[PDB]
Write a protein that binds this ligand. Structure first.
Ligand code: CU
Length: 128
């Protein structure tokens, strides 16, 4: 079975995937984030952060306030289910989390927390 997805965040402030449906049989799910292009993390950093649909705005806003040195995320934010590092061009990072953290009927959102990125960067996630 497929329990992984490869996602790219580029210099155009776009994710190449904006919808992920996780199979219920998967024990763990993996997101492999990469950054093709030429721009560094201080100006075009991208992360893949997962929260419930209701918690998205709060994670993004409190993330902007945390700054670059904290990867634009409130440290150990309880609303964050899974997160990758903030990556620049030529860098990559993967995050694997337990599918038991996802509930039937609940809606999740994945997004980048770099200031302003979430306007285009993102997508929906839920159990298949
Ligand atoms: Cu970004």
């Amino acid at each position: 079975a497929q329990c992984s997805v490869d996602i790219q965040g580029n210099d155009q402030m776009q994710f190449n995937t904006n919808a992920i449906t996780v199979d219920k049989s998967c024990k763990q799910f993996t997101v492999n984030l990469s950054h093709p292009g030429n721009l560094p993390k201080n100006v075009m950093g991208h992360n893949w952060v997962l929260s419930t649909a209701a918690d998205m705005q709060g994670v993004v806003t409190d993330g902007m306030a945390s700054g670059l040195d904290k990867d634009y995320l409130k440290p150990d934010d309880s609303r964050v289910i899974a997160q990758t590092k903030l990556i620049g061009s030529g860098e990559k990072d993967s995050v694997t989390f337990d599918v038991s953290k996802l509930k039937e009927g609940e809606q999740y959102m994945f997004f980048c927390t770099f200031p302003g990125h979430s306007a285009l960067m993102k997508g929906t996630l839920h159990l298949k």
